[PDB]
Point group: D2
Chain length 247, copies 4
Amino acid sequence: SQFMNLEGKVALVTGASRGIGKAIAELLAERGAKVIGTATSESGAQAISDYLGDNGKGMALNVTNPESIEAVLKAITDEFGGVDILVNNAAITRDNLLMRMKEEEWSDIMETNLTSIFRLSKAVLRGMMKKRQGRIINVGSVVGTMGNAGQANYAAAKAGVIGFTKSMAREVASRGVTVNTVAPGFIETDMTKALNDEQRTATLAQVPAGRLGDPREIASAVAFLASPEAAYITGETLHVNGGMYMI
Amino acid sequence: SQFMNLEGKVALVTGASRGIGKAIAELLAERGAKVIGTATSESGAQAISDYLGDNGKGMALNVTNPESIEAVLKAITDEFGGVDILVNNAAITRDNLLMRMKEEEWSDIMETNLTSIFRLSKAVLRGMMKKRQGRIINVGSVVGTMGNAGQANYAAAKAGVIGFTKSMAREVASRGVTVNTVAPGFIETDMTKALNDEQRTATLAQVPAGRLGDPREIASAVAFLASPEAAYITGETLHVNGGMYMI
Amino acid sequence: SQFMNLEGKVALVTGASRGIGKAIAELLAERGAKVIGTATSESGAQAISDYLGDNGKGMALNVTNPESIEAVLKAITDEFGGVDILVNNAAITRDNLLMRMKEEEWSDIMETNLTSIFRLSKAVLRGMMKKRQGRIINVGSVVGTMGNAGQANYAAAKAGVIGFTKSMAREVASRGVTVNTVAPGFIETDMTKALNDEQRTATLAQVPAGRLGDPREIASAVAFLASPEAAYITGETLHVNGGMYMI
Amino acid sequence: SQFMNLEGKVALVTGASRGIGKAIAELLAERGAKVIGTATSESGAQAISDYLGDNGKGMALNVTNPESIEAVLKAITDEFGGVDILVNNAAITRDNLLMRMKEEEWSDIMETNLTSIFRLSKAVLRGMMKKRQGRIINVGSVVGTMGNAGQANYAAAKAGVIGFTKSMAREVASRGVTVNTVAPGFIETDMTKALNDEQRTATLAQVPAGRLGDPREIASAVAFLASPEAAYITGETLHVNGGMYMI
């Protein structure tokens, strides 16, 4: 149908090897987008190419490196045309209580989870503004809004992306580009599967819905915001957390 | 497709004669819901029957009257089965600066815009919780979050709906019912069309997107939250305001 | 000192017999305000007269009754001059899960906890705006922002007060009146003392600070916003909740 | 009096040469704190020493340099005892629309306005936690919550400080340390005085109060949060913006 239809859009989804990123890439492709998913390695890029088949391709991208960003966008533009939808999903954790947090653990998070968003966003924005049409969707976290003990670096970066998003949104709204954040709660992924029973139960105790989210549920929220129908949503943070936090 | 598919769901959409409510009713029907839309008058109800055709019907409902609510829900359950999706869209304005605001202008807004949501939500919840599946979606306003001079009553009611929504979300999350608000900005409606050019311009000046929203844009957000895919979103307020306010 | 000095200000503090309201009345008096505190009963009012002594007096006030409001304001203006600081502290609870919540439990909370704020704020605003100086401070609750199962009525009312507060703040900012909310978390009161040990423990478990708040801690926040020094704070909600919720 | 009394507290106020930082340092000293204010140069440190007289001293601090931080805290501890109140006020701007924003302009803001807060906070926290008493107050900006075109870097850093603050707050609340942000709106300073008439009027048009804030008004909010009386406020953002934004 013509509802939530992404045919004709080119989507770049960072960190698309697995979990939330993979679910995003698959759904955008299902809705008709030509999808380029990225991983930090060629092997990862190949796995992305395999799941996407005729609907797109995988590319190796170093999200903390200017040169890689330039080569990847050049290749996408040449084959597919300009990126219409950027989904900033690639992110890392370096957890520690503040008194144990290393300088490097702070700077690695800032680099990968915040400065990367500045870099990629800037790199795709010029084409979006010329077209007067574009979507930038950041995959954040409930932690950016709620805070979390042991993750002050992660929280800082995720919260920073929201402040960046609102400012970008104000800059580019009148030119038909929207900029938004989707903030997942506790989603079932390799990382959550690696927690023990006591930790899972303690985390679930804070979720009114009483279960972990599915990566597809994050995908659906991203797909919604990517759509033509979401053109009047900008500078927003869409929380998908089963009631863990309510703003 | 199976995507954002409401076949098998019965939707009650209050205040569905025109504008946002009509757009909601039409889009839910398009996505496969059986839709009952309401109006104050039997002729309004017939106009709703006429635009829905085989996909539902119109009923007269007074959202401030317990007996009317009871009769309408009875008729819906009898013919369609119990309500699966409630959209609380019926609302009024009684604008005035506080020093000119009459007691009845306050109380009428409380009754129509806040108490009605209590009454209708309570009336549909029992069925939804037995089924362990449901959706309650309130159509709010940016005014509830932002405040607006000359609309302290409307703002209070709309903000109250959010408090109600968060509490109810907490109450019924573990039983598969989500409760959310869609908060429109300045949407093109009869009321906005009746503003003079200086008033329209002044309001557009506060919208980074530089245009009014379309009722279908509000409908799209409501259809998204009504969907199976939105099961992990609860206690949330989805802002659709062209960047007029950024939370 | 000249710091946080309320000499020359007349303060009306509703529901000042005990707990938070009493703490507010006492601290405003300590900072030099002439304070009128209210209770429902004449014996309550006399207890307020007794603790305030030369720094003010107690009056019986029914915050849901227009005639009572008019009589009390008349008596205050006659003896003290017009109200400069209104503290809307009087509130009740009528807890129940929504399916057990009676119509009167809903309406009584709306009347006492939200409509009263409209009525009293309107009744004092004219004087404040003629003077181009005033303070309206609502005593809210973390429940208004967080939601709470079993308190959808209380949450709605408290959230409504915030919408009202933002709108009124917008209306009267340029005329030197500020309008704000103080939102307490779990504060030690008679009601909290009547909880059993399992209930107290469970609530403390949601407070990072690991204790209940003291009524004087709420009083301090109210005195701060009442001060000349807080003239640039308006439309704000000051959370005092030991980290129970972080906005 | 014993109200808002900081006698016995040692306060470190970064960027205290002028404006908001100077106003903070002066008021904390007025309320009885021993105050160390910092500047980036010895000349600045001397001017701080001059205004503080017997109530404290000025010190040169490079907020983006570990070694400077260590020497300054050592000197303070030796003479005054451990820092009880840290006010992170030092911050810079490197404004530009995103398409013109240089890599260096991003990284300079991240360094000075966000990473510095991580560094200084960590450096003072151990002593505060041993004492089970402490205040960390970040001077943020309305821009961190609202966003602002031309300041996506500044907004990102300021928003990041809030996410850091909430996480720190959750980490250290049970040990009597509070961590909060004060978010100024448009405050009269050298920078605002350097704007032309058209820019000032355009900015003032967005402030309901209809004037710029005074640095002393920011100081008062900081002093309040620094006080013993604010012990039950943590993880909070206190907005002082004349209604420019209302959360």
